[PDB]
Amino acid sequence: SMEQVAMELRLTELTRLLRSVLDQLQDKDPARIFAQPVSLKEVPDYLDHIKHPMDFATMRKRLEAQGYKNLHEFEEDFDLIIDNCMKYNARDTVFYRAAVRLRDQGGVVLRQARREVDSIGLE
Ligand SMILES: CC(=O)NC1CCN(Cc2ccccc2)CC1
């Protein structure tokens, strides 16, 4: 129907917005600590600690399959990346500190993304 099409146009423009956001978020991770899933070969007991792993590559796959219906779902995954890291890694590690910096810098991007989502009405 025309309705389904209109909906899909909105999802596509949401996806376009979120792709930009993801690219900006990933720029705040120059070391690329969060670029890929934690390796179960290098950390074989990771899943004993973290029940819902997340990383930027995994987000990008969901993103490109238009799997984020709204900004909230996207933010959920971004928060997983940060929160998983700050539990698994101790406070005085380069890993924990990278997540803190990513959280803080990312918040600026996500704050304006929320306004753009609401203003354009993409949800
Ligand atoms: C996102 C996140 O938490 N990434 C990593 C942080 C620390 N590394 C340490 C490490 C390196 C090499 C072998 C075994 C463990 C494991 C996972």
Task: Tell me the C-alpha distance between 101 and 51, whole Å.
Answer: 23
- With a 6 Å cutoff on the Cβ, whether 11 touches ligand 1 is no
Q: Return the amino acid letter for 98.
A: A
Neighbours of 44 (CB within 10 A): 9
**What is residue 93's DSSP assignment?**
S
> What separation in angstroms does the CA of 19 have from each of 15, 72, 76, 101?
6, 14, 15, 21
Cα of 92 vs centre of ligand 1, distance in Å, is 14
Atom of ligand 1 nearest to the CA of 84: 3
Q: Return the amino acid letter for 15.
A: T
Cβ neighbourhood burial of 42 (10 Å; 0-12, 13-18, 19+):
exposed
| Domain total in the chain | 1
Residue indicated by tokens 């990312």: 106
> What separation in angstroms does the CA of 21 have from each of 1, 26, 91, 120?
30, 9, 27, 15
Cβ neighbourhood burial of 113 (10 Å; 0-12, 13-18, 19+):
buried
Task: Tell me the C-alpha distance between 102 and 110, whole Å.
Answer: 12
Residue indicated by tokens 């219906």: 69
Q: What CATH number corresponds to the domain at position 59? A: 1.20.920.10
Sign for the pseudo-dihedral over CA of 93, 34, 39, 70: positive
H or E element at residue 109? helix 94-120
Cα of 112 vs centre of ligand 1, distance in Å, is 31
Q: DSSP assignment of 58-86, as one string?
A: HHHHHHHTT--SSHHHHHHHHHHHHHHHH
Contact between 61 and 22 (Cβ < 8 Å): no
The structure was resolved experimentally with X-ray
H or E element at residue 20? helix 2-27
Domain coverage including residue 78: 1-123
